[PDB]
């Protein structure tokens, strides 16, 4: 399936509600349903990359696009003091959905270590 056969694929296809911050032809930014900071959103590709460890070399621009979109969305949402960007891979990464997604968290002090 297209956008893939995860819940994020459902969100991409508008089959399920999410709180959308930004969209383009490549990617989708939306507020995380289980926020871990006063602001917490995801930026996800429209193309179904299951996990960063299977991303291809020619996905490079796409992956950077998620970070560029993430930073623009953070600024638009008033995260002047900063934020943290997180991509989780696999079991040890605490990856929760098998669709690549870039977390963006702020509106509070993020701590170290990052989990």
Binding site for its own copies (CB under 8 A): 36-37, 52-53, 55, 57, 59-65, 67-68, 71, 74-75, 79-95, 103, 105-115
Q: Which residues contact 13 (CB under 8 A, 6 or more apart)?
A: 2, 3
Q: Based on the residue annotation, tell me whether 99 is a catalytic residue of this protein.
A: no
What is d(CA 52, CA 60) in angstroms, rounded to the nearest whole number?
A: 11
Task: Between 7 and 110, name the residue whose CB sits nearer to its own copies.
Answer: 110
Catalytic one of 40, 99, 101, 111: 101
Q: Is 95 annotated for ligand binding?
A: yes
Task: Between 11 and 40, name the residue whose CB sits nearer to its own copies.
Answer: 40
Q: Which residues contact 55 (CB under 8 A, 6 or more apart)?
A: 49, 63, 100
Q: How many C-beta atoms surround the C-beta of residue 15 within 10 A?
A: 10
What is d(CA 79, CA 15) in angstroms, rounded to the nearest whole number?
A: 30
Closest contact distance (angstroms) between CB of 1 and its own copies is: 24
Closest contact distance (angstroms) between CB of 15 and its own copies is: 26
Q: Is 99 annotated for ligand binding?
A: no
């Amino acid at each position: 399936r297209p956008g893939g056969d995860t819940i994020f694929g459902k969100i991409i296809r508008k089959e399920i509600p999410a709180k959308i911050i930004f969209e383009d032809d490549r990617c989708l930014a939306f507020h995380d349903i289980s926020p871990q900071a006063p602001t917490h959103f995801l930026v996800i590709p429209k193309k179904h990359i299951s996990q960063i460890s299977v991303a291809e070399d020619d996905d490079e621009s796409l992956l950077g696009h998620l970070m560029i979109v993430g930073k623009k969305c953070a600024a638009d949402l008033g995260l002047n003091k900063g934020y943290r960007m997180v991509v989780n891979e696999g079991s040890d990464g605490g990856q929760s959905v098998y669709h690549v997604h870039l977390h963006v968290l702020g509106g509070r002090q993020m701590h170290w270590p990052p989990g």
